[PDB]
Amino acid sequence: TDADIAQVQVQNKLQLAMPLLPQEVQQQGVSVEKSSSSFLMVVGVINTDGTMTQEDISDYVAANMKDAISRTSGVGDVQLFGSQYAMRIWMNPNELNKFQLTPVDVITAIKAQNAQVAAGQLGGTPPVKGQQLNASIIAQTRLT
Amino acid sequence: MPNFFIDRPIFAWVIAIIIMLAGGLAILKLPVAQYPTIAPPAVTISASYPGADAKTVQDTVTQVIEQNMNGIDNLMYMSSNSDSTGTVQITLTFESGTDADIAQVQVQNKLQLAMPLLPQEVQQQGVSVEKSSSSFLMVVGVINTDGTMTQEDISDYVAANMKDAISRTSGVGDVQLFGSQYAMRIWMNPNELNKFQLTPVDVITAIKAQNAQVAAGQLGGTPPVKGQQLNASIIAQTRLTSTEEFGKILLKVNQDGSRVLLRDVAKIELGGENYDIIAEFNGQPASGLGIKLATGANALDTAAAIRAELAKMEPFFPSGLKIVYPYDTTPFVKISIHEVVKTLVEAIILVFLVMYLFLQNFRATLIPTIAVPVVLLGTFAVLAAFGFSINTLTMFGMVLAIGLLVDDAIVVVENVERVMAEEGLPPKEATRKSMGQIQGALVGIAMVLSAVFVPMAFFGGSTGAIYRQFSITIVSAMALSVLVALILTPALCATMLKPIAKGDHGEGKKGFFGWFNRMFEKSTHHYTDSVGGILRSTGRYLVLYLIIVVGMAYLFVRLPSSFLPDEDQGVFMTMVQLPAGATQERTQKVLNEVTHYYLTKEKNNVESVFAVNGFGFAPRGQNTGIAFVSLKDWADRPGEENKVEAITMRATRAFSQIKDAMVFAFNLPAIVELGTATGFDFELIDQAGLGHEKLTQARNQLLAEAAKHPDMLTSVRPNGLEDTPQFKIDIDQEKAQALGVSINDINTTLGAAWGGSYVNDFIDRGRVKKVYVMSEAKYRMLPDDIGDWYVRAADGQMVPFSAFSSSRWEYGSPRLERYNGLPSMEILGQAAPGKSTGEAMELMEQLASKLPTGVGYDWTGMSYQERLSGNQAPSLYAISLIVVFLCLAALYESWSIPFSVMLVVPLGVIGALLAATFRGLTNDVYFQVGLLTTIGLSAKNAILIVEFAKDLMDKEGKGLIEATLDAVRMRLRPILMTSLAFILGVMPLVISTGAGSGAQNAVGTGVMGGMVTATVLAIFFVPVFFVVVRRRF
Amino acid sequence: GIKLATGANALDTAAAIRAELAKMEPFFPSGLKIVYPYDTTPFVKISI
Amino acid sequence: PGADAKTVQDTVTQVIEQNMNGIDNLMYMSSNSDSTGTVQITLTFESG
Amino acid sequence: ERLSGNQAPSLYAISLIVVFLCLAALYESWSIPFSVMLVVPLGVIGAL
Amino acid sequence: GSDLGKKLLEAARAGRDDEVRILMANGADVNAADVVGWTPLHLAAYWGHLEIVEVLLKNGADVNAYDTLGSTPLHLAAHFGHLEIVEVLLKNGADVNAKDDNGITPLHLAANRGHLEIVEVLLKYGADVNAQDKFGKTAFDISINNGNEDLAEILQ
Ligand SMILES: CCCCCCCCCCCCCCCCCCCC(=O)O[C@H](COC(=O)CCCCCCCCCCCCCC)COP(=O)(O)OCCN
Ligand SMILES: CCCCCCCCCCCCO[C@@H]1O[C@H](CO)[C@@H](O[C@H]2O[C@H](CO)[C@@H](O)[C@H](O)[C@H]2O)[C@H](O)[C@H]1O
Ligand SMILES: CCCCCCCCCCCCO[C@@H]1O[C@H](CO)[C@@H](O[C@H]2O[C@H](CO)[C@@H](O)[C@H](O)[C@H]2O)[C@H](O)[C@H]1O
Ligand SMILES: CN(C)c1ccc(O)c2c1C[C@H]1C[C@H]3[C@H](N(C)C)C(O)=C(C(N)=O)C(=O)[C@@]3(O)C(O)=C1C2=O
Ligand SMILES: CCCCCCCCCC(=O)OC[C@H](CO)OC(=O)CCCCCCCCC
Ligand SMILES: CCCCCCCCCCCCCCCCCC
Ligand SMILES: CCCCCCCCCCCCCCC
Ligand SMILES: CCCCCCCCCCCCCCC
Ligand SMILES: CCCCCCCCCC[N+](C)(C)[O-]
Ligand SMILES: CCCCCCCCCC
Ligand SMILES: CCCCCCCCCC
Ligand SMILES: CCCCCCCCCC
Ligand SMILES: CCCCCC
Ligand SMILES: CCCCCC
Ligand SMILES: CCCCCC
Ligand SMILES: [Cl-]
């Protein structure tokens, strides 16, 4: 069986199911892969000077190394032995209740104040007659 | 095998007939295009984020898609651009030989599962995955001459009435609209919105409610009450269809009872989906269709079919609408076929005249006139079997092989005529003996030429695919030439030729031929006397050979290297680049001046100017433009003064006077994907999250160092754009919450007004089209206009933007580049005059190694091709030489004698180099393939001389010099006949100054010069080589 | 943890992985080092 | 769902069919736009 | 059905020519093949 | 403007000391402004080109030149953490309490990015610590909101 056509046929059917799946599952990213069940190799990464922790090395591999290896021809699947960094907001229920707030309010505020806004241009097309200024309008950007 | 077919001429005829029918069928059915598929397979991912800046596009779209392009097969590299027009283009380039359909579907499938991660605005617009292709068959311009239509009106008409019908035309692959179908444009007024306490949020909400398709159900649907008589579908709310309906969209009902409609707060019209591009054709508004040829289709049939469809659309056009053809390749391809068919016909006529001049019987002149067409036809059947097309490269590949085809015909027939004249044998017995002398050599030649040309097919990348076109074409024609020479030609000779009495060399005739035969027989004695003198003093000719070899090596190094010669194709582009922040109106004034020039000062040359404002070479924006010039017929432009090169240099010089703009004209390349010979393509990479500003500093550091080496590097610049001043506005979160104003309402109001918002779809005359809400131009021009926009608070009060916002000027990128998922900056440049591409690249690497920590680099495009193409050459040259030697060793049964043949190579190369150098031409592929065919024919001439000489020594027991003199005597006439015919055959190609002359000159010049020296020197030097080699070993 | 794509060559893919890792090594933060704790390909090369 | 044949044809069928250019060995194309809200565009290709 | 009927004449023409040429090559003759190929109508009428 | 005015704006931004030198000798307009109202001194201050800032001030560049949104070169230098340029501009008579259209001062911008050395230099040249922006916010109100406890102590 041509593995290319097998993958193509499987995904054509998966795409009919995708809309019916929960929004949380879609946002985690569904993956269709054609690979062996066993490992070809394990590429281990360490810090000999002991300057970087297990989490620091895991983030570096994920952020700088993994993507290029995943795109390499013949690499069917790549498994990170660790986790990429995320902005972790560890909520306190005692402090949330104190100010009469919930996780719903925390999530709403992050979506609102961690936003990348498309705000158009000064002197954008179609413009008026005799326009001299053309500049991108920069509003809210992602927090860093 | 020749003996077999001498006794069986009908069988020989049956094979020739079958070959001609297969070839005759091939000619009818073979695809036709200008060039074949050369570039490696590339897939482009295009997305639009309306009103988004470069960083917004990159950090929400580009990076998300890039991170998800995993588990795809045969990916070489990935590159992307994110610009301030709200556009992202990610290009994935694949290994040469990859199935482009499988490449696309794999990319497309990985994007599909990454779509839920993209912004809802980008998901709504869509993300196109297409196979990257630059080559258009033709560009159909659609204009309005009576000034009753805008470019938006014409674009909508073409989309609705023309595009689909052109897409269904026979041989048409893809069709690109130069514009968009209408969009329902709601131009909002902030003064009117604030007056009724409304915002863009309310306008979008109302349109979504009052322009929608609502599912109802059925009367008497299943399961029903038994006895039900009727079952009908219930139709509820359907989409709005007109500007009138959109204007009557209810927004608000006032306290008194008066109604606020959408037409009260906004101007409503059918307009363009976007207004970035302004297209003009000789000043008049214009749209158009960019048409590509389908796979395995005929360019000439497709172009005829396209014009046939447009012809029967003519009667239904609105008043003023006119079709124009600013770009069409088929008139150029029509000439290319005619000129190649002409060359082949003239070559057959020239052979006929030469054959009659020497042999002086019409029966002899027929055998080549039959054999050569049979080989040519057979070649087409083999191209079709390989899945090749009738294209510029394959056509000139057969022109370059004419010399080899013609020689096979002459060599077989001439040798029979001699044997009959020298011995008085009857045609059939003479043919048997004649073939007996050459049949072993002809097979040896077939293997030697295979050893030369076949390895040329095994180069990788773009240049390898080009060389593969010439390789298979020449090898196929050569292979069939030898089969026809071993099967048909001997059978024709034995049956058609007239017997010659022994000793009859035609010296006893009267008139021209009596004189000629006596002149030539006397000249043959002068030649053998001269060789006798040369072979008494070989030492001085060995010295002269080393002068030629040194002179060759010197001229090779001096000759500038190119890919394909630039042609006058009746069109050329003019670039218009204004400084940073320059508006669309300023760019139009420069374009209007550029157009006015071409229609005034080049009115006898220029037919039309296609001025496109908002689109450059690589970049987009209001400060970029391009003027595609279309010239009159070649016949109306006589002399070099009225050609693209002369006009280009004239226009560029005239436009250097233009202020606050960088303008210049230039000719189109033969094939865009190759770039320039000596030109390199460098990528500077952020390898440790340094950021944009630090990669810019590192780029400036590299560019400055490159400027200190003008001896090696020339015009080393960035391919991208510089940082521009951008209007940063900060929303005060505390003030918004204090006033009871939601951030969604603020960012929607700003985004929808200033950037534009794609709300939903409506149906215009039975066609689904987009609905856009945006600010009427005058209220979104300047920073002071920010305060004119009001957002409604929770308590109902209208709050101006100034109350909860603060702004400042800062610098940011209007175009962010990435390479293999990392931030990058593309640097273009070329090797300085006299320097190789390799040397220039080595310095850039040396300069790159001295840049700040975390700044890497990589080679892309032609530079990626050049490296992997250069690493193979030594191996492919070695294999060729080794197999040539081994083949000659088997033929001559000698490890030493093969050297006497292989020493001929420089004799043909020096003549090609002198001709190319003198005429001021380059070391292009046509010249390079020309060298191999020149080397090939001279090698064949030497093989038959050495074979005759060796056989005389072995069979008749003659001495070394006696055999050598008797050999070159017998071989003089056939060598001169081929040379005389072939040199005259390529004379029209050399002197050609018409359309496609650039390629003709490149093919002709190098071949003529090479043949002249190859012929003159070899007849004197091959005798020396054989004697010297035989004496030594 | 790398897994071989269906019908792909183990040695060619392993060589292509090492070639890509070689491009990353020079821009490593101080101390960071690649180790090879598990590889099935050395056996195939050596055994042949 | 809920759209009549005409609505289905204008919003779906013609949007898909106008993009079915530049496909190899395509003999003919047939489609049905129905009251059920359903589209079925069948592309028949050359033998082989 | 249309395709089948349209291509049948050319199939007969090429078929007759291939048999003729095959006989001409085998028997080293133009007379034997032509003498043989004249028989075809005697068969075809019986089939009709 | 003029032809040389454009080249000085480009050279000042790019950090080309040699080109600025030749342009000052040839008499390139130091008061040349782009469409947003940025002088060569604005650009030199923004990108942190110390020598060009000094050369421009020697050749009579307006130290208190403001853009179309009322921001000065000291605003730019203070915001992007260019300590040496802030000192040079203040020695050549840059308004330490210069307010943009938003009521923002060089102290506000320095406090926002946590440029402690620059904040101290501004206070040394008499930066109004009680100066409020359009939202009634001081440099101290920014430090407590940003959570910069080192900066908050300096501003008392
Ligand atoms: C839709 C389908 C598309 C296809 C298009 C149609 C193409 C059709 C082509 C196929 C038919 C082949 C043509 C046959 C021609 C034969 C000529 C016969 C001559 C003749 O009668 O004289 C013979 C003797 O002459 C001799 O001995 C003759 C010797 C020299 C050969 C004659 C020249 C042949 C030229 C070939 C035709 C080229 C056409 C190019 C396509 C007598 O016969 P005999 O048996 O008594 O002779 C003794 C044998 N020992
Ligand atoms: C031993 C006896 C054998 C019998 C044949 C004798 C051959 C010589 C005489 C033939 C009679 C005709 O004579 C012939 O006239 C023609 C026409 O002017 C000449 O014409 C030819 O030669 C002249 C030079 O002389 C060339 O410039 C010209 O291109 C060529 O056509 C011949 O040179 C001449 O030989
Ligand atoms: C760079 C461009 C020029 C390169 C061209 C080279 C090949 C074409 C020129 C052919 C010249 C051959 O011409 C031939 O030269 C040799 C020289 O060895 C002469 O030979 C002469 O010298 C030799 C050696 O001492 C004597 O043995 C001989 O008796 C005497 O005639 C021939 O009489 C002459 O017919
Ligand atoms: C560059 N290109 C070949 C031309 C030439 C002349 C033109 O007159 C035009 C183009 C590009 C096309 C692209 C189209 C694109 N699309 C196919 C609708 C498009 O989405 C955009 C866009 N910026 O998103 C256009 O500008 C565009 O509407 C446009 O205005 C064009 C246009 O008017
Ligand atoms: C009789 C022996 C002939 C040996 C030469 C064979 C060369 C074939 C090399 C090859 O396969 O590639 C062809 C190449 C494609 O880029 O085209 C070429 O570059 C043309 C080669 C011209 C010069 C040949 C060397 C003679 C110098 C002394
Ligand atoms: C009978 C003549 C035909 C022979 C031609 C076949 C040659 C095939 C070319 C093989 C390519 C080898 C490339 C090696 C590159 C390794 C780089 C060190
Ligand atoms: C590709 C070139 C290979 C050349 C191989 C060398 C051949 C040496 C010739 C020796 C001849 C032996 C003479 C008889 C003793
Ligand atoms: C690349 C490997 C093959 C090279 C060609 C081999 C040539 C063999 C020459 C042998 C000469 C033997 C001389 C006998 C005295
Ligand atoms: C395999 C390399 C090509 C060598 C061809 C030489 C063929 C010589 C045949 C000589 N012959 C037997 C006909 O006399
Ligand atoms: C119209 C298509 C058939 C003719 C094409 C020309 C082929 C000539 C190639 C030498
Ligand atoms: C010394 C010069 C002699 C030239 C002899 C060459 C004659 C060749 C004519 C075909
Ligand atoms: C290509 C045609 C071959 C059919 C005839 C068989 C030839 C045998 C003659 C001895
Ligand atoms: C010796 C027979 C050769 C003919 C086959 C094509
Ligand atoms: C060009 C495709 C068909 C070839 C016939 C063998
Ligand atoms: C001996 C007859 C040769 C057959 C060629 C097909
Ligand atoms: Cl950054």
Numbering used by the authors:
A (entry chain A): 98 to 241
B (entry chain B): 1 to 1033
C (entry chain A): 290 to 337
D (entry chain C): 50 to 97
E (entry chain C): 866 to 913
F (entry chain D): 11 to 166
Paper's wording?
In an attempt to prevent ansamycin binding, we made the switch loop more rigid by Gly619 and/or Gly621 to Pro substitutions. We assume that the Gly619Pro and Gly621Pro substitutions induce a switch loop conformation mimicking a transition state during wild-type L to T conformer conversion while the HMW drug is bound to the AP.
The E. coli AcrAB-TolC drug efflux pump contains the inner membrane H+/drug antiporter AcrB comprising three functionally interdependent protomers, cycling consecutively through the loose (L), tight (T) and open (O) state during cooperative catalysis. AcrB is the homotrimeric IM proton-motive force-driven H+/drug antiporter component which recognizes and actively transports multiple drugs (antibiotics, detergents, dyes, and solvents) via the tightly connected AcrA and TolC channels across the OM, leading to an observable resistance phenotype. Four different entry channels (CH1–CH4) have been described with putative entrances from the periplasm or the outer leaflet of the IM toward the two drug-binding pockets, the access pocket (AP) and deep binding pocket (DBP) inside the AcrB pump. Here, we present 13 X-ray structures of AcrB in intermediate states of the transport cycle.
